Each structure stands twice: as structure tokens, then as C-alpha cells.
Amino acid sequence: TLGPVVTGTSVIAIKYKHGIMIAADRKASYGSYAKFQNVERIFKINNKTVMGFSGELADAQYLHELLTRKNINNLSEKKRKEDMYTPQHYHSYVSRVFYVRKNRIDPLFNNIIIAGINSQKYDNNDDNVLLEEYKEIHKDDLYIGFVDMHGTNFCDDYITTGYARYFALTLLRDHYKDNMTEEEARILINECLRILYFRDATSSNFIQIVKVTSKGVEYEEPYI
Amino acid sequence: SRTTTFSPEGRLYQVEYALEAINNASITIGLITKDGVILGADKVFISKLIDKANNYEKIYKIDKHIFCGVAGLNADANILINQSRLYAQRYLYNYNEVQPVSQLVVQICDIKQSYTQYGGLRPYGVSFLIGGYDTKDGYQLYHTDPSGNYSGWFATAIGTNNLTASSVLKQEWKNDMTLEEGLLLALKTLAKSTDTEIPKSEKIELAYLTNKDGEVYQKYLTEKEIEELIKLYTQKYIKE
Amino acid sequence: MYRNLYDTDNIIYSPEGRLYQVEYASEAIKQGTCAVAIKSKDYVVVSGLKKCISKLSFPQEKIFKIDDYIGISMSGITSDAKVLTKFMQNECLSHKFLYNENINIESLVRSVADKYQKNTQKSSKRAFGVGLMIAAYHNEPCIFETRPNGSYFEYDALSFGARSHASKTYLEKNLHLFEECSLEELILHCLKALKCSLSSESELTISNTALAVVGKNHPWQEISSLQLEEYLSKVK
Amino acid sequence: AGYDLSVSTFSPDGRLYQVEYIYKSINNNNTALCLECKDGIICCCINSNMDKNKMIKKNSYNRIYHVNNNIIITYSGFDGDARNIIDRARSEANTYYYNFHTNIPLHILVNRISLYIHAYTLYWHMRPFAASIIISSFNEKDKGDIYCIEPNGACYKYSGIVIGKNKEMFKTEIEKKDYKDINVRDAIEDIYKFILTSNNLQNLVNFSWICKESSYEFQNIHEEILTPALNKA
Amino acid sequence: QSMYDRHLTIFSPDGNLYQIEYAIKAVKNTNITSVGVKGENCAVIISQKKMATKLLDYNNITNIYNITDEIGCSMVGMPGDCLSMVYKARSEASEFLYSNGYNVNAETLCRNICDKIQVYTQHAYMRLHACSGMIIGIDENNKPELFKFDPSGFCAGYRACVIGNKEQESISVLERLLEKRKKKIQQETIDEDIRNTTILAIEALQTILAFDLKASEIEVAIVSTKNRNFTQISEKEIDNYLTYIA
Amino acid sequence: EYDRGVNTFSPEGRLFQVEYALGAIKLGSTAVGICVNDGVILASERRISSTLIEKDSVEKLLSIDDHIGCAMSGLMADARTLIDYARVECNHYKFIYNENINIKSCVELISELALDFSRPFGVALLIGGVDKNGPCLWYTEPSGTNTRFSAASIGSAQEGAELLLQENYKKDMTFEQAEILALTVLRQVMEDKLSTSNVEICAIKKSDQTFYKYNTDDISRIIDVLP
Amino acid sequence: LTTFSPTGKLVQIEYALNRVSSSSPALGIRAKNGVIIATEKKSPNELIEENSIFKIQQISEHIGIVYAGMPGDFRVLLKRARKEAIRYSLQYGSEILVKELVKIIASIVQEFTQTGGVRPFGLSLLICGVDVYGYHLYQIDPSGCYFNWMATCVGKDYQNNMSFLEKRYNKDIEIEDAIHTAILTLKESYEGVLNEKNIEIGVAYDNKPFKILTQNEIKDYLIE
Amino acid sequence: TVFSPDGHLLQVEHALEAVKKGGCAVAIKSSNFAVLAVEKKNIPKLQNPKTTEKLIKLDEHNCLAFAGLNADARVLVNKTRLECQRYYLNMDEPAPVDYIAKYVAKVQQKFTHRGGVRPFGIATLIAGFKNNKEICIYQTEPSGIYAAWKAQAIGKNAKIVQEFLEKNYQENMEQKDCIFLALKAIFEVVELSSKNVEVALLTEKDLTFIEEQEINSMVELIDQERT
């Protein structure tokens, strides 16, 4: 492709004790205006890992389909619960897809964030592809990776892509604590995306919050 | 077996049968004169319903100064003529001059040699008397075989009854031969090879080059050879 | 019309229903030397017997290495076994380069068994007559093996063609290896299989029986040329 | 006069030999079974190869494969050649998922798998496949359907079918009870009774059922439901 | 003895391709027949619904395959070869649209199929496709067209033809059945060809197969004008036409 | 009798086209190589029966590189093709990695070229060198079996030289110790006299790590010790 | 792979010539104002419509062809014949000459003899048509050679069928007079005495475009 | 091309025997020149130059007189003359005789190892110059083997002519003396016809033929030497 014709906003991934918190709005701007305001960006890729976008939304299907396909292929060879593709594998594979595109000139403008649980100590050896209490993780079994369009890849404790890198990350680099509660994490993002409502020209409401816990991949939809 | 395999005697099989396959084909006569090379032919008559006046399939044209008299499989002959016409024209396109026949038979025997060496295909059951005129060494007359071992000559009689017709040219041929005397010389060997005394004239065809600084290369009509046939009656250059 | 028509081609089938060309390859692995592996609860030991062709010669290697936690032991012809080793080495090393996790064992043998399959339907290429023996440990130590036709069997003990019947019978009545967590009793139990299944009146283990272990905190450590003859090649 | 050598040679009688021998090849291998139920499609696979190894793991030699969460596939014959068809089956689903963003339906997958098996029969150099494939599924609205793919195409819809070394034996046992409207939880106990008729008390029969209103997706054998086997009645 | 019928591209001393000749016997050995007949502004194909020689769902087994929504066809012979021939026809008829805009003609479809069939004959690439079929369909000229193709190259086309194992015991019957409508009454065309041709078509199948011809073991299709869809006639209409023999 | 195909097996589990070449290597000139603790010494005959030959154009001990020398047997026209291939990959290895190739890594690639599935190469070699880890001597076959030998022999008379080395090889033998030993086995199986022209020994010392062909002058001082 | 023989003759070609020696008789006769062709259409029944199965096809507006062998091969050689009548018509704006056309089809038939693993064509052609150099009637042999005939037959039993033409043919015959000498060479030659619109006849029709004579048109000549 | 059950090659030994039914050709080395010799036959009063059937050039300093299949030399020479000129284009030096012979031998070897290709039924001999001012006459067989010589002969009954050359071969000869030795090799064609033997004197890096005039002055002396 050439030129970010249908861009996207920025997502925020923060980890805590019960799981991974992610958030994204539903605005898909056509450059200078809000063409689509009800699109999804937080994509479910497994029963334990998800991935978000930024950048051109059109160059995400060439990455979403090339990723959800690998999940079904891995699910068809699930001879043990430990054979599930860990988030370390998906993040390293996505970086390889961007690196082979970087060798050419077309880079497929995106700044994919991959988050998930990098462990197998919580029984989920049964997959429900087509649709009680939480647990406490040791902060090392929670993988959150970032991938730039240039192929830059790493992993940390809190990642924020796109245009919120200059806004969200600043408020979040000093306010982030270890083993935050569930109400602490959602109140941290709620006060964070508010800053991204009066400054980002391409952002909106409909914060599709998605949490990845030791029991599934939930979905919620506030409006601030 | 296939052409790729050899034989314990050292010879081959497919190229040996092709050498015999041309022995069951019509005869052709080659002859170098002091004016230009001439050729002979034998139109095999399956019936009297052929055109017999406009065409003949024993002598073809390669270029404006190179022409051959084919003898063998008439079907496989058309491929090499369609292959030699390209080499006679690709040389002009690459060097802006006519191609010498010595550089043409080498270019055409290699296409036969390439078939009796690999590919696992049958060889070319064809052999022809190809002659022409060149500025390097005058008139020439070469002769190819299905194996590719070409060789220059003065007179050759391949086809059927070669050994008998070639012996006629061992004595009756002379170093100095005019165009009219050469035609009468090649007319008798073309007739006595078929165990006859006179050609029916609804038979054999002749061609001649005789470069008059422009390489005229005229062919013969059924009426033009009548005068040649009549001259054989009076002056008989007999079997011997 | 039988006994000689349906025998030399990898395409034709017998009227009974047996691919007799591939069936010769399964028997071709029986002409090789013996090998045996023991799957404990957390360790896997592979005992391989080399073959000194001459007094001046050196015993050719039997147990190989693929990765840190993956090591195979061929039993058959050295021509095709070396080709499968390079295919298994370039495959597992590519997995540690394209991604960062180690390669799954069953997902590796599925690629190796597929290599046998690709060399079974084509008329030109023949079948690899070699009995592979993949021993590895990722999360639970598993032992896989192949045949000329594509197969996998999560075995617990095996044997390979020399005196396999005398060795299979020893392992059939020795199923306490799962609780023999002590590595010392495991390697003595594995070496006892060869000692009770060697040829008649031959040298027991005169430093010519390759041994390799792999486990939890153990990579594919080849048993050194000194740790086996001190007490392991001296108990019997 | 020996006309059954290659696959491209037609017999003078009119039959196609060298492909009929494959039926005699799958008749000596282990069997597989499946049947329609009013709650799902229970499958079955007996591995009658106990008298020679006795060292393999209990639940290792599995012959139940699925292209995705709602279509199961089993083998009957050469286990090595069937791996190549599953690779062509999963790739067919993934190619259909890229171009159409949906799960591949059953009546379009079976017609594409049968073409793949039949395509190797036509060649003069590639040997034909030696594995009969059972493809089944169970829709939520519509009931299930089992497609049987044998060598040399011939995709046929069934309602219960057995292929292996006792296809002329178990076929008479299925027509007795109308399995079209019973259950899955009772048929599993009836299936284990059939195997005892035709050869020991061993757990070498691994099998799963696609639907028990368990999200209508392919489950596992669920050992706890398999252990109370009625070993006497 | 070891005669000259081993390969497919090798002629016999008398000059007969025996690999093709044996392939036609494969269709005659499947004991599955089918009748096709074209009348005025219509044409029909009558199947037989039989397994190519318990619990088999009989609605699935058939011998009728629509290539397009306008051109339908039948298939006989080996079940493996007939299925691949439809795919080598559906991918060809649809290719005509992408390469020429218009819908493919019924006569052009059969000649394009025979072109690919003839290629496999002169070359020893693959085995012959032991199948046959009756390509049906109307054209732009508002005329019905029927075409039959053997395992070798053939674009014969018939106003009424039988394909299957009984082609040597049906020409004497189809000629009389066609004569029972051509040189007979022939009053008009009230667009009731179904009651005129299909009734004089199912009657032809009953004269070939000595059974009672159960309605749940036969399915027909019409491509007549005003319909143009190669619609498989429902079961209730099939059983209704079977009682018209009285 | 199964001999049509090249890749056909046997009911006894054996190859056929490879086994035909197993007897073809027993017709070339004899050779013998000894791997001692200080280096590797090779030896061969020189069938130059016709005196019209140049005597230098025909050689039995070519060089894979400056650190690896080898022998030849069987089809001399096919032996040069494998040596030319070994001279490429060993030199190609020096261009990639700055160190010299290991014989264990070189003999494994000289054997994979004898796995063309053309026809198998009917040639057996005696590749030796002092690459690393001291000196090593390997002996390959057309079947692909690469067995490291301490002292072996290939040729038409390789049977007699086999038992001779078993009764003469000692681990503590130096260069001059084995140099006489590399000729006493040649003195036994020889239809001529061990002159200064029929023998073409060469050795690779561990010090300089390079091979040096023993010329006509140097071999005269070794063939006259009378073992 | 149709190799040679010790006698010096192709055996597969000789076998191919037997196939054209046992098919329907094709017959072409040239005249001084056009060329005519004829073929005994063996009607097996009344089911085969005559307008579908034919033995006289066209190559251009002035070239007519006749088949004499394997009916399945009556189309593949036609497709490459019309293709050569187009490749010559694209470059050269005029019409394709018969000698230029027959030398290409003879080269196509030739390549199906020397190529390995192929089968020679089981048919004999009869190319006829108006040319700027008069009229022509060529005959292509499965071996690959071609003859410049004047009046010939290639079907079954042509050794005696040509005997009618060797004694009932003159060099100057009109096209209308040659029709009855051609029908006599079909009806009075062998069985098929019930010649009632069961013979296809094409003519050059005195330099006009190629005309396929209809059944009722031939009926005017079938009365004698 | 496959092996034999004992170890030979039925496709090579047949081809090696195919060169025995061909015109003889003898070469002889000297100090700073190398005269060649060949014996052909032609039909009288026809075939004037025999299109220079033997003594083919490859460069300004590399003659070549093959023996065997006359038609199979064109493909061998054209695949050689191209390589003789291609070497001059990549190394800027006229191709030495050591490289041409190593190329012709690799051409024939590349034809027997591959499958579905008939071997080159032609045995040759190349006489040229090395890089230094030297002359080494090579000789290649259809099997692929090659070796230098001081004199060599190939063709019909080459053993009886090579045996004679093994006895009276002096070390260094004169230009006329070296010709007389090559002209004493008419032990293949009876009556020693002057219209049958063809010799060329390759000297000072410039090939030239030998006129029939001086041939009669040397071919007649042999008849007056047997008594």
C-alpha cells in the first residue's frame, strides 16, 4: 500500500495482577474526518492472547488473517495443553512478517501491540472458538510486546502505540504501580484517555476495553 | 533399442537403419561443371494424378545461391529445409553477406548430429546433395548423411541404386565440363539408374546454378528438358 | 502370475494390498546394529552400540545430536540417515531463528515423517530405508521413532534390528523404569538391556557403546569416555 | 496378461485395475467408525495392533484429526499417506478462510479433498493414495452428515459407516438400532459393546464426539465418560 | 500374448487405440444408464440414481451436475473420473465469462471439453477419463441443444440419445419413441413440452429398464424456455408423471 | 535378478546399483595410508608400464587443498570429478570461514555427492590431513560409509595390505618409522621392484600443517633401507 | 518415441496409415474453375443431427478442409489450422495461400512423430481452395508429407476407388460436370447406394467464397 | 548409463570399442616442436579436400587430430574451440594445452555420468604448448581418462603401431628425423600410399602442413629400408 488513507487511533496496554488490560476507541478516521465510528481494533487471536492496532486499518487485515490462520493450525495439533502458541511466539512471528516487508519497500503501516499470558498453569485445555474467580500472576507470565512498522520489537510492562505515545505514556510512566487492582487499572486508563479526547484530532469515545485474565478474553464498552 | 545406446560392434542402430532407409528412396544426382553445379532428381510416381507440371519435391531452394536436392523421407526433409533456410538467413542478418556452403553444412549437420546423441528421439532419415556458389572457393557440392559426416564431392548418386549410378560418373565425368555437356552427362546416369534407356520426361527433374555474376539459378520445366532428352538420342553417352 | 511382477517399483501395489518395495525398507533397518532408549519420569537415556568393521578402523558413530534437548540415533544405512539429520538440523535451527521458543518435539517429527512421505509417491526417488530414533525432552521426556512409511509412536523403550527380539523381551518385563528416577539406576538398566541382548560370546562394552542422556537440567550431554568405564561398564 | 502394473493401464474387461488393490490394502488395516445421532456425531477408531508392540503410550496413537473446531477426519489404511491428505485438508480450509473469511462448509471441502485423491490416480508416475477418509460434521440447525472418501474419489454421504478390517461385520450391527434419534451418551456405551464381539479388554480405542451440546465443537475422548464401559452386557 | 495395448499413445497393427477402446468399456461396465432427449423448445436429462458398481442417503447420490445456471449436464462411468470432469468443465465454462463476457454456448462447451480430452490422448501424461455425459442447455438462438461426448473426442449432438450400459439396446426403442411424436399427431406447441416430451422420455426409460422405476430412484431436469435454470424436478412431480403411463 | 532400476531395494534389505560399484573399486592401483601421532603418510603405485608416458601427468595422489591430500582408486575418470568438487568446497570454505576445513566436515560432503538420487561414483578415497585435533585419516566408499581409519588400503591388492598393517601398526610410530612401514606393505603386493619411480609417497606434517610431495630424490633415501 | 525399424521404415506411421484406410471415404477433384470435395457421411441413425457432425469445415473464406480419420482428432488439427490462418492474416493483410498453409500443418503433423511419448495423427487431410495462383487440392499424410494432387481419394478401399478417377477424368472439366463424376465415384464405387442427402460436398464455386452445399441443393444432382 | 554386475560399464566399453573402427592417427613429441600424423582414405576422382577431416586447429598454437567417429568430432571441436577462446577472454592468455585437454576430458566425462546421453564415441590427442615454452602431447579417451605422452597412437589397430613406436623412440630428434619416425608408422595402411598419409609440423607456436612433394621424398625411402 501507499499512504495511511484509513488510519486509526492509539491503544494502551497495561499489565497488573489479575491480567492484561487493553483499551481502544472505535474511531476509524479517513484522514481528515471520522468516516467510520463503530469499528473494532482490539482483535482476539487466541484464548489467552490478543492484539491491537494503530496506523492504517486496511493494512491490518493482511496481518489479522495471516495471524488467526496460524491459531487454527496450532489448535489442530493440540496434543497437550503446553503446545499452545505462547505470546512470545506470536510477537516474534509478527516481527518477522514486518522484517520481511522492510526488506522490500512496502511496509504495511501499523504499530501492532501483542499482549497475552505467557504461561500454562491455568487449565484451558478445551477451546471454544466460535461463541469464576480470577487469579494472581507473578508478573513474568504476562507478555506484552510492541512492533513498529520498521520492525522494531521488544516487550515491557506497559506499552502505548500511535499518537498516544506522547500523551498516554507520559502520564502512565509515573502513575503505574506494581500489582494494580482491577478498579485501579480501569481508573488509570479512564483518566488517561480523557487527555486523549481534548488533544488528539483523531480520537473519540467508545473505549472498547478488553481484559485478558486466567479464565478468558472478556469485552466491555464504556463511554466516559 | 533407443538411439542413445551403442552396440557391441561399435556402430549404432537408429542411425544405421536411417542409412538404409534412404536407400529405398528415389535417386538424386550431383555434378560440378566448369560453369555451375547441376542436380538431378527422380519423381516417384504413386499415380498419374499428381500435378506433374508445377511442383516437384526432390529439389528445393535454400537461398538465392544455395540449393539442395533432397533424397529420403519426404516428410522429414521439409524440417531441415525449414531449418536450413533460417541459417541461410540468420547468417545474412548477422554478417550482411551470403553464407558459404561450407559454413552451412556444418550448421546443418550439427542439427542431425544433435539428434543422434541425446534427447532419445529418432534421427533424421534424410540425406541430401547441397551445392552452391561462393566467392571464397567457387562452385561446391557437399553431401550429408543421417549421422552428420558430410564430405565434399564432384558427383554423387544417393537414393536407390547408388553404387551403379556412381560408377557411371567414375569414367564419363571429366574435369572440364560445359553446362550443356554436363546436363547430357547427368541425364544418362539419371536414366540408367532406373534400368531404363530413355526418361519418360514425366519423370526426372533437373536444376542448375551457373552464376553469371548474379547467380541466376534457373530450374527446369517439362518442355525445357525435352530438348535435352532429344540430344541424348543422337549422342548417347551410354552405360559402359 | 505372481512373486516377481509386483516387486521392483515404488508405485505398483500387490494384489494382496501390500507395497512390497516399501516393505523391504522396513526390513532393511534390521541389518543395522542395535540401539535402545529408556524413558524415565524426567530423563531419557539412549544406548547405542557401534560397529568396529576392522581392527585398524574406528567405530562409526551411531548416536548423533540435533539440538540441546534433541538427539537422534540412527539404525540402518548411513547414506539416508545423514540426509535426514541435516534436514532435522536445518529445521530445528530455523525454529530458534524465526522464533525464539524451542521447536515442539511432535511438531518436528511430523516434518521428518513427512520427508519419508514425499519420497514414497514419486517414482524416481526411493524410500529412506532407515529406522530413526528421536529422543528428546521439552516438558515431559518423550521418545519418537519413524519407519520408511510415515509413523510416530510415543514409545517408552525400543530396539533396532540386531537382536531386537532378545531386547524387546527384556523391556517387556522391565516396566519399572518410570519410577527409577535415579539416573544411575537408569543407565545401568539401559546398559543391562544390551548386555542381555548382545551376540554370543562377544565383548560386553569395551568403550564401544555410545551413551547419551537428556533431561530437566540436562542438555544432549554425550556420556564422556571416562564416566562409563569407571562404574557403568564395570558392574557386569 | 499382467495389465494391472501401472495406474494408467485399463483392463480389457473395462475395469480399472491397480486401484482396486487398494481396497484390499485398506481391508487389512485397522478400522474406524462413525454414526449419526440426534445430539451429535460420535466417532470411533479401533487400533488392532496390540500383539506386536505393547510399548506405546496409552493415549498416543490417535487417529482422529480435525481441520478446525467443527469437522473431524479419520484414517483407514496407510497412516503415512493419510498425513499428506490432512495437510491438503487444513490448507484447503486456510485457503478458503483467506478468500472468504468464513469456515469452509462440508459439501465444498469433501468435493475438494476427493479431487486431490483422485488427481494422483491419473498420473503415470505418482502412486495413488492408500487411505480411506471419513469426513463428518454436525450443524446446529441441520443435523449431521458423514462423507466417506475412499480411493478413486467417490464421495458419498452416509449416516453411519465403518471401514477397515471388519466392514462386513460392524455394518450389520448398526442397522439393528435406529441411531438417528437416540443420544450420544448412550451410543458410546453401545459402541464399546460392539468391539467386544469382534479382541481383548484394552483401552486401545480412542474416539471423540463432535457434539454433546458442548458448544457444538470437536471435543476430546473425555476419559471419565469412557471409563464406565459396560464390559459384560 | 503381449499385444499392443500397453501404452495409450501406441497404435495397433490394424490401427486401433485400445486404451481408448477399453475406456469406453469402463462406462458400459458401470451399469448406470441415462436418457437425454430434446423436443420443441426444451430438452431433458433422466438420471438413474444408482451406486456405481444400507445407510447411503439417496438424495446425495446422483448423476446430474449443473455446470452453470444455464448449462447442465449428466455424468456416468467411474465416480472418480466423472467428478473431476465436472470441475474441468465448471472451471472452463466460468472461464469463458471472464475471457469473453458472454455466457458459454452449449455447443462450444462440449467442443472445448473434447479439446482437453484429445490432448491427453496424444500424450502419455495421464490416464484417460473413463466417463461420458450429456451436455444440455439452450442457446441465444432460443433453441434447445443436447450434446453427448464419449471418452474420446466427440461432439455428436442428438435430439434424443441414451448414455450408459444400454446403448446397444436402446436406439431401436428411442427411434420409435421419437417417431411416436414426430410423424404422429404433432398438433401445436402450447408450451406444455413437459407433458409432451418428459412424458415421452420417462416412457423411454421404462422401456429400457424392466423395473417398475420407483420415483425415489429417478430425477430429471428441464432447461426449457420460460424457465432457463436446469431445475431438478421435485419428487412429487416425478411420482405424478409416473402414473401417467396408464 | 533385479537390475533395471537404480533405486531398487532387495528382499534381504540391501541396495543393488551401489553394490555393483563395490567391486569396481577393486581394480585400480593399490594404495595405503598410515595415520600416525605426528601426521599422515600416503603411498601408491605408478602403472606406467608403457615407457612413452610423461610419468608426471598421471598421478594417484592429488591434493584437495594444501592441508588435505588424498588417494584414488576405481574409475580414474570419475575420481577427478569428486576431487575437483572437493577442491571447490574446501576452498569455498576458506573464503567463508578463515580457518581450514575439518576432514570430518569435508569427507561428509565428499560422500553426499555420491548420493545423486545419473549413476553412483565408482571410486574410493583415502582422504587424510592435519586440519585440527591432530591428524586424521578417512576412507570413503561409493555407498557413503565414512569410516575414520588409522591405517587402511584401497586398490586391486588391498586384501594383502589389510592383514599386513594389522600385524605392523603401532601407535608410537614416528614419520620415519611409518615411512618404512608404508613401503614394506608395498613391497609385498607389487609385480615390480620398489624403484624410485613406481612409488609416489607424500606426507602432511603436523608442524607446517601442509603437504609436501616426496620427490624422486627424497624417496631414494627411503626405499633403500630394506625393511 | 516412434522409432525406426531394421527394414528402414517407421512402424507407427505404417500403423497410422491403416486407420485412414478403414474410415469413411473422402474425395476431392480439382477442375479448371474451382475444386470440389466430397465425403460419404455414414449416418448411423436419425438421432445425429447433420448440422452438428460434419466432415467439411472451413479455414478461411477461401480454404476448405476434409477429414478422413480419427473423429476425435477432427478438431485439434482444425484449431491449429485456423490459428495459422490468423497468424498469417495478422502480419500479412491478404489471404493465406494454400501452399503456405499446408506447409505449416505438415510441419505440425511432423512434430508429432519425432517427439518422444507422442502419438501420430490418425487422419488424412484434404486442403482445397481458391488461390491467386489457380486452384489447389493438397493431401496431408500422417507421416508429415504432402502431395500436390489433382484428383484423389483417401478413405477405405482407395486402391480401386482411384481407378474410377484414372479413367473418368479429363484435364479440362467444369465444376458442374465434375460433380456427377464425383458422385459416381461414391455411389457406384461401393456400398452406400441409398445416397439420399447423405453426402457432404464442398466447392470452391468459381472464385467465390467457400460454399457448403445444402441437402436439397445436392438433391438436384442426386437424381442422376 | 548404469553399471555392470561385476563392475564395468557397458555404455563406456562399447564406446571405447567404437573408436577402434576408425582411421589411425599418430603423434610424436620432440624438443621444441611436435609433428603429427594421420592416415585417411578417399574415393579417387571425387572428394577433393576431404573437408580437412583431420588435423583441426583450436588456437594459434593447439593442433588436434582426432580418431573415430568423423561426425562426432564437430560437436567436440565446436565445444572446444569455444572454450579455447573463452579462456582467452577471461584470463587474457592463449589457452595452454594443459587446459584444453583438461576440458575435452571433462566434456566426455560429463556425457557418460549423465543419463539419457550417448557418450562421445571419439578418442583424440591434442598437441600444443604449455604456459612456458614447452610442448606436451596429450591424449584423451571416450571414458574420460587423459595423460600426456612422448608419442601416442589411436585408431584401427593402434596397439601394433604404438608397440613399434615404443622401441625406436629417441629422446630428441631433428625436424626431418622426427617426421621419419612418424612416417615409419604406415603399419596400418598397406602399400604406403602418398594420398593417404597426412602430416603437419607444429613448430614455433605456428602450425603448418606438409606438402605432398616432400612426402614422396620420405615415403619412398621406407621401401628401400626393409631389405
Short mmCIF file of N, CA and C in Angstrom, two decimals, chain A residues 5-45:
data_model
loop_
_atom_site.label_atom_id
_atom_site.label_comp_id
_atom_site.label_asym_id
_atom_site.label_seq_id
_atom_site.Cartn_x
_atom_site.Cartn_y
_atom_site.Cartn_z
N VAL A 5 -4.37 5.96 4.31
CA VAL A 5 -5.65 6.55 3.92
C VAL A 5 -6.70 6.38 5.02
N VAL A 6 -6.81 5.21 5.62
CA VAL A 6 -7.78 4.96 6.69
C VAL A 6 -6.96 4.64 7.93
N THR A 7 -6.62 5.66 8.70
CA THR A 7 -5.80 5.48 9.89
C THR A 7 -6.62 4.96 11.06
N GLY A 8 -5.99 4.95 12.22
CA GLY A 8 -6.61 4.51 13.45
C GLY A 8 -6.03 5.32 14.58
N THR A 9 -6.60 5.15 15.75
CA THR A 9 -6.14 5.87 16.92
C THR A 9 -5.09 5.01 17.63
N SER A 10 -4.80 5.31 18.88
CA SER A 10 -3.80 4.58 19.63
C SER A 10 -4.42 3.75 20.74
N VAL A 11 -3.78 2.62 21.06
CA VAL A 11 -4.24 1.73 22.10
C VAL A 11 -3.28 1.82 23.28
N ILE A 12 -3.72 1.31 24.42
CA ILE A 12 -2.93 1.34 25.64
C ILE A 12 -2.99 -0.03 26.28
N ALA A 13 -1.84 -0.65 26.49
CA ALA A 13 -1.75 -1.97 27.11
C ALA A 13 -1.01 -1.84 28.43
N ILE A 14 -1.65 -2.26 29.50
CA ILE A 14 -1.08 -2.20 30.84
C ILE A 14 -1.34 -3.52 31.55
N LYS A 15 -0.32 -4.04 32.22
CA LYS A 15 -0.49 -5.30 32.92
C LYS A 15 -0.59 -5.08 34.42
N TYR A 16 -1.25 -6.01 35.09
CA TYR A 16 -1.46 -5.93 36.53
C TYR A 16 -1.48 -7.35 37.09
N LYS A 17 -2.02 -7.51 38.30
CA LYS A 17 -2.01 -8.83 38.93
C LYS A 17 -3.02 -9.80 38.34
N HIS A 18 -4.25 -9.37 38.08
CA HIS A 18 -5.22 -10.33 37.55
C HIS A 18 -5.03 -10.59 36.06
N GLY A 19 -4.48 -9.64 35.32
CA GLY A 19 -4.30 -9.88 33.91
C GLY A 19 -3.82 -8.70 33.10
N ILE A 20 -4.15 -8.69 31.82
CA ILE A 20 -3.75 -7.64 30.89
C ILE A 20 -4.94 -6.77 30.57
N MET A 21 -4.77 -5.46 30.70
CA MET A 21 -5.82 -4.52 30.37
C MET A 21 -5.43 -3.83 29.08
N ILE A 22 -6.39 -3.72 28.17
CA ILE A 22 -6.15 -3.07 26.90
C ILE A 22 -7.36 -2.17 26.64
N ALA A 23 -7.15 -1.14 25.84
CA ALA A 23 -8.24 -0.22 25.56
C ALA A 23 -8.01 0.44 24.22
N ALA A 24 -9.11 0.74 23.55
CA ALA A 24 -9.07 1.38 22.24
C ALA A 24 -10.45 1.93 21.93
N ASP A 25 -10.47 3.03 21.20
CA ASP A 25 -11.74 3.62 20.81
C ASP A 25 -12.16 3.00 19.48
N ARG A 26 -13.36 3.33 19.02
CA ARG A 26 -13.88 2.77 17.79
C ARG A 26 -13.84 3.73 16.61
N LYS A 27 -13.04 4.78 16.68
CA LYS A 27 -12.99 5.73 15.57
C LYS A 27 -11.98 5.32 14.52
N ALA A 28 -12.45 5.19 13.28
CA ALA A 28 -11.62 4.85 12.13
C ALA A 28 -11.74 6.06 11.22
N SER A 29 -10.80 6.99 11.36
CA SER A 29 -10.84 8.21 10.58
C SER A 29 -10.26 8.03 9.19
N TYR A 30 -10.87 8.71 8.23
CA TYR A 30 -10.45 8.70 6.83
C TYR A 30 -9.52 9.89 6.59
N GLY A 31 -8.50 10.01 7.42
CA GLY A 31 -7.61 11.13 7.23
C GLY A 31 -8.10 12.37 7.94
N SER A 32 -8.82 13.22 7.21
CA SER A 32 -9.32 14.47 7.77
C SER A 32 -10.66 14.36 8.48
N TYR A 33 -11.35 13.21 8.43
CA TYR A 33 -12.63 13.15 9.12
C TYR A 33 -12.95 11.75 9.59
N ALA A 34 -13.93 11.68 10.48
CA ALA A 34 -14.40 10.44 11.08
C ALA A 34 -15.39 9.76 10.14
N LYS A 35 -14.88 8.87 9.30
CA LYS A 35 -15.76 8.14 8.39
C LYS A 35 -16.47 7.02 9.14
N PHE A 36 -15.71 6.12 9.74
CA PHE A 36 -16.25 5.00 10.49
C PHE A 36 -16.05 5.26 11.98
N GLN A 37 -17.12 5.12 12.76
CA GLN A 37 -17.06 5.34 14.19
C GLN A 37 -17.50 4.12 14.99
N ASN A 38 -17.60 2.96 14.36
CA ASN A 38 -18.01 1.76 15.08
C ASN A 38 -17.21 0.55 14.62
N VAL A 39 -15.90 0.70 14.48
CA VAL A 39 -15.06 -0.40 14.05
C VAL A 39 -14.34 -0.95 15.28
N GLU A 40 -13.85 -2.18 15.17
CA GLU A 40 -13.13 -2.82 16.26
C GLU A 40 -11.65 -2.86 15.94
N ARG A 41 -10.82 -2.69 16.97
CA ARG A 41 -9.39 -2.72 16.74
C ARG A 41 -8.72 -3.74 17.64
N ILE A 42 -9.27 -3.97 18.83
CA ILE A 42 -8.70 -4.98 19.71
C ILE A 42 -9.16 -6.31 19.15
N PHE A 43 -8.24 -7.06 18.58
CA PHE A 43 -8.56 -8.31 17.92
C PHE A 43 -8.16 -9.51 18.77
N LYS A 44 -9.08 -10.46 18.88
CA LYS A 44 -8.81 -11.68 19.63
C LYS A 44 -8.07 -12.63 18.71
N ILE A 45 -6.91 -13.11 19.15
CA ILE A 45 -6.11 -14.01 18.34
C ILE A 45 -5.98 -15.39 18.95
#
